[PDB]
PDB file of all heavy atoms in Angstrom:
ATOM      1  N   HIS A 300     -17.314 -11.135  11.546  1.00 40.68           N
ATOM      2  CA  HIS A 300     -17.910 -10.007  10.647  1.00 40.68           C
ATOM      3  C   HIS A 300     -19.001  -9.523  11.469  1.00 40.68           C
ATOM      4  O   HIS A 300     -20.195  -9.913  11.224  1.00 40.68           O
ATOM      5  CB  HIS A 300     -18.439 -10.551   9.368  1.00 40.68           C
ATOM      6  CG  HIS A 300     -17.558 -11.475   8.622  1.00 40.68           C
ATOM      7  ND1 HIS A 300     -16.936 -11.014   7.537  1.00 40.68           N
ATOM      8  CD2 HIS A 300     -17.052 -12.767   8.847  1.00 40.68           C
ATOM      9  CE1 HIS A 300     -16.149 -12.045   6.977  1.00 40.68           C
ATOM     10  NE2 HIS A 300     -16.397 -13.092   7.804  1.00 40.68           N
ATOM     11  N   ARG A 301     -18.738  -8.646  12.485  1.00 41.96           N
ATOM     12  CA  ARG A 301     -19.852  -8.156  13.233  1.00 41.96           C
ATOM     13  C   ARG A 301     -19.821  -6.682  13.678  1.00 41.96           C
ATOM     14  O   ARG A 301     -18.812  -6.231  14.230  1.00 41.96           O
ATOM     15  CB  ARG A 301     -19.913  -9.073  14.594  1.00 41.96           C
ATOM     16  CG  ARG A 301     -18.611  -9.481  15.238  1.00 41.96           C
ATOM     17  CD  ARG A 301     -18.920 -10.065  16.621  1.00 41.96           C
ATOM     18  NE  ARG A 301     -19.539 -11.387  16.342  1.00 41.96           N
ATOM     19  CZ  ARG A 301     -20.311 -12.101  17.251  1.00 41.96           C
ATOM     20  NH1 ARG A 301     -20.405 -11.411  18.476  1.00 41.96           N
ATOM     21  NH2 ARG A 301     -20.910 -13.176  16.996  1.00 41.96           N
ATOM     22  N   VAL A 302     -20.924  -6.078  13.488  1.00 42.41           N
ATOM     23  CA  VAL A 302     -21.095  -4.614  13.834  1.00 42.41           C
ATOM     24  C   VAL A 302     -22.142  -4.512  15.025  1.00 42.41           C
ATOM     25  O   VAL A 302     -23.009  -5.333  14.976  1.00 42.41           O
ATOM     26  CB  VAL A 302     -21.549  -3.863  12.627  1.00 42.41           C
ATOM     27  CG1 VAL A 302     -22.175  -2.419  13.102  1.00 42.41           C
ATOM     28  CG2 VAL A 302     -20.401  -3.651  11.637  1.00 42.41           C
ATOM     29  N   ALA A 303     -21.912  -3.541  15.862  1.00 40.10           N
ATOM     30  CA  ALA A 303     -22.933  -3.439  16.952  1.00 40.10           C
ATOM     31  C   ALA A 303     -24.229  -2.802  16.680  1.00 40.10           C
ATOM     32  O   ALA A 303     -24.369  -1.936  15.787  1.00 40.10           O
ATOM     33  CB  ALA A 303     -22.082  -2.514  18.061  1.00 40.10           C
ATOM     34  N   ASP A 304     -25.194  -3.367  17.218  1.00 38.47           N
ATOM     35  CA  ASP A 304     -26.616  -2.822  17.061  1.00 38.47           C
ATOM     36  C   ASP A 304     -26.620  -1.351  17.290  1.00 38.47           C
ATOM     37  O   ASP A 304     -27.072  -0.549  16.541  1.00 38.47           O
ATOM     38  CB  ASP A 304     -27.638  -3.528  18.084  1.00 38.47           C
ATOM     39  CG  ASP A 304     -27.949  -4.871  17.689  1.00 38.47           C
ATOM     40  OD1 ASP A 304     -27.995  -5.353  16.482  1.00 38.47           O
ATOM     41  OD2 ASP A 304     -27.977  -5.839  18.577  1.00 38.47           O
ATOM     42  N   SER A 305     -25.965  -0.907  18.351  1.00 39.49           N
ATOM     43  CA  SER A 305     -25.832   0.422  18.571  1.00 39.49           C
ATOM     44  C   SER A 305     -24.474   0.860  19.027  1.00 39.49           C
ATOM     45  O   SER A 305     -23.770   0.004  19.492  1.00 39.49           O
ATOM     46  CB  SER A 305     -26.689   0.837  19.960  1.00 39.49           C
ATOM     47  OG  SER A 305     -26.940   2.180  20.060  1.00 39.49           O
ATOM     48  N   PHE A 306     -24.109   2.093  18.657  1.00 38.46           N
ATOM     49  CA  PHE A 306     -22.705   2.585  18.852  1.00 38.46           C
ATOM     50  C   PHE A 306     -22.394   3.299  20.029  1.00 38.46           C
ATOM     51  O   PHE A 306     -21.287   3.803  20.388  1.00 38.46           O
ATOM     52  CB  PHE A 306     -22.241   3.403  17.796  1.00 38.46           C
ATOM     53  CG  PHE A 306     -21.840   2.672  16.499  1.00 38.46           C
ATOM     54  CD1 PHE A 306     -22.176   1.379  16.188  1.00 38.46           C
ATOM     55  CD2 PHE A 306     -20.814   3.226  15.728  1.00 38.46           C
ATOM     56  CE1 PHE A 306     -21.713   0.726  15.151  1.00 38.46           C
ATOM     57  CE2 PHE A 306     -20.228   2.538  14.591  1.00 38.46           C
ATOM     58  CZ  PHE A 306     -20.741   1.353  14.274  1.00 38.46           C
ATOM     59  N   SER A 307     -23.506   3.451  20.982  1.00 39.29           N
ATOM     60  CA  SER A 307     -23.426   4.078  22.257  1.00 39.29           C
ATOM     61  C   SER A 307     -24.485   3.936  23.143  1.00 39.29           C
ATOM     62  O   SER A 307     -25.569   3.327  22.765  1.00 39.29           O
ATOM     63  CB  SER A 307     -23.212   5.622  22.053  1.00 39.29           C
ATOM     64  OG  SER A 307     -24.319   6.173  21.358  1.00 39.29           O
ATOM     65  N   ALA A 308     -24.317   4.236  24.491  1.00 41.19           N
ATOM     66  CA  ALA A 308     -25.420   4.133  25.367  1.00 41.19           C
ATOM     67  C   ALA A 308     -25.170   5.097  26.495  1.00 41.19           C
ATOM     68  O   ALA A 308     -24.351   4.827  27.364  1.00 41.19           O
ATOM     69  CB  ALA A 308     -25.361   2.669  26.077  1.00 41.19           C
ATOM     70  N   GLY A 309     -25.770   6.222  26.299  1.00 45.16           N
ATOM     71  CA  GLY A 309     -25.630   7.438  27.228  1.00 45.16           C
ATOM     72  C   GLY A 309     -24.187   8.033  27.014  1.00 45.16           C
ATOM     73  O   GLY A 309     -23.975   8.322  25.916  1.00 45.16           O
ATOM     74  N   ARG A 310     -23.519   8.315  28.131  1.00 45.20           N
ATOM     75  CA  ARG A 310     -22.150   8.979  27.918  1.00 45.20           C
ATOM     76  C   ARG A 310     -21.142   7.902  27.670  1.00 45.20           C
ATOM     77  O   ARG A 310     -19.873   8.264  27.733  1.00 45.20           O
ATOM     78  CB  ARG A 310     -21.905   9.849  29.307  1.00 45.20           C
ATOM     79  CG  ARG A 310     -22.672  11.067  29.338  1.00 45.20           C
ATOM     80  CD  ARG A 310     -22.493  11.688  30.675  1.00 45.20           C
ATOM     81  NE  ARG A 310     -22.962  13.150  30.726  1.00 45.20           N
ATOM     82  CZ  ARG A 310     -22.339  14.137  30.114  1.00 45.20           C
ATOM     83  NH1 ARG A 310     -21.220  14.025  29.587  1.00 45.20           N
ATOM     84  NH2 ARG A 310     -22.913  15.307  30.216  1.00 45.20           N
ATOM     85  N   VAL A 311     -21.513   6.729  27.461  1.00 44.62           N
ATOM     86  CA  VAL A 311     -20.581   5.655  27.003  1.00 44.62           C
ATOM     87  C   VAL A 311     -20.774   5.294  25.596  1.00 44.62           C
ATOM     88  O   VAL A 311     -21.769   5.138  25.000  1.00 44.62           O
ATOM     89  CB  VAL A 311     -20.759   4.424  27.853  1.00 44.62           C
ATOM     90  CG1 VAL A 311     -19.846   3.235  27.439  1.00 44.62           C
ATOM     91  CG2 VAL A 311     -20.570   4.605  29.370  1.00 44.62           C
ATOM     92  N   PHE A 312     -19.572   5.333  24.799  1.00 43.71           N
ATOM     93  CA  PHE A 312     -19.459   4.938  23.487  1.00 43.71           C
ATOM     94  C   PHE A 312     -18.600   3.781  23.089  1.00 43.71           C
ATOM     95  O   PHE A 312     -17.800   3.342  23.827  1.00 43.71           O
ATOM     96  CB  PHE A 312     -18.984   6.174  22.748  1.00 43.71           C
ATOM     97  CG  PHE A 312     -19.949   7.375  22.597  1.00 43.71           C
ATOM     98  CD1 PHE A 312     -19.972   8.174  23.711  1.00 43.71           C
ATOM     99  CD2 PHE A 312     -20.737   7.657  21.534  1.00 43.71           C
ATOM    100  CE1 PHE A 312     -20.773   9.309  23.774  1.00 43.71           C
ATOM    101  CE2 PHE A 312     -21.546   8.684  21.590  1.00 43.71           C
ATOM    102  CZ  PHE A 312     -21.634   9.570  22.647  1.00 43.71           C
ATOM    103  N   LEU A 313     -18.673   3.281  21.775  1.00 41.67           N
ATOM    104  CA  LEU A 313     -17.892   2.155  21.369  1.00 41.67           C
ATOM    105  C   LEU A 313     -17.137   2.725  20.117  1.00 41.67           C
ATOM    106  O   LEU A 313     -17.619   3.485  19.288  1.00 41.67           O
ATOM    107  CB  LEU A 313     -18.750   1.031  20.969  1.00 41.67           C
ATOM    108  CG  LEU A 313     -19.657   0.585  22.089  1.00 41.67           C
ATOM    109  CD1 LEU A 313     -20.604  -0.638  21.605  1.00 41.67           C
ATOM    110  CD2 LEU A 313     -18.754   0.043  23.260  1.00 41.67           C
ATOM    111  N   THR A 314     -15.896   2.295  19.876  1.00 43.71           N
ATOM    112  CA  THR A 314     -15.053   2.642  18.711  1.00 43.71           C
ATOM    113  C   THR A 314     -14.004   1.602  18.436  1.00 43.71           C
ATOM    114  O   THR A 314     -13.407   1.020  19.338  1.00 43.71           O
ATOM    115  CB  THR A 314     -14.386   4.039  19.090  1.00 43.71           C
ATOM    116  OG1 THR A 314     -15.322   4.908  19.450  1.00 43.71           O
ATOM    117  CG2 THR A 314     -13.744   4.588  17.740  1.00 43.71           C
ATOM    118  N   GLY A 315     -13.667   1.423  17.116  1.00 40.64           N
ATOM    119  CA  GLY A 315     -12.756   0.404  16.639  1.00 40.64           C
ATOM    120  C   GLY A 315     -13.553  -0.984  16.629  1.00 40.64           C
ATOM    121  O   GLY A 315     -14.770  -0.981  16.519  1.00 40.64           O
ATOM    122  N   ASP A 316     -12.830  -1.965  16.879  1.00 40.11           N
ATOM    123  CA  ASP A 316     -13.354  -3.279  16.799  1.00 40.11           C
ATOM    124  C   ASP A 316     -14.507  -3.429  17.711  1.00 40.11           C
ATOM    125  O   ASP A 316     -15.371  -4.318  17.567  1.00 40.11           O
ATOM    126  CB  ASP A 316     -12.182  -4.345  17.121  1.00 40.11           C
ATOM    127  CG  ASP A 316     -11.324  -4.625  15.801  1.00 40.11           C
ATOM    128  OD1 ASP A 316     -11.343  -3.752  15.046  1.00 40.11           O
ATOM    129  OD2 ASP A 316     -10.690  -5.649  15.860  1.00 40.11           O
ATOM    130  N   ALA A 317     -14.468  -2.616  18.888  1.00 38.52           N
ATOM    131  CA  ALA A 317     -15.469  -2.740  19.845  1.00 38.52           C
ATOM    132  C   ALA A 317     -16.750  -2.346  19.144  1.00 38.52           C
ATOM    133  O   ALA A 317     -17.963  -2.924  19.489  1.00 38.52           O
ATOM    134  CB  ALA A 317     -15.227  -1.758  20.897  1.00 38.52           C
TER     135      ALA A 317
END
Side-chain angles (χ1 to χ4, degrees):
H300 310 254
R301 43 176 62 201
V302 166
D304 289 320
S305 196
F306 274 34
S307 58
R310 283 171 170 289
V311 177
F312 293 78
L313 305 172
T314 311
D316 282 23

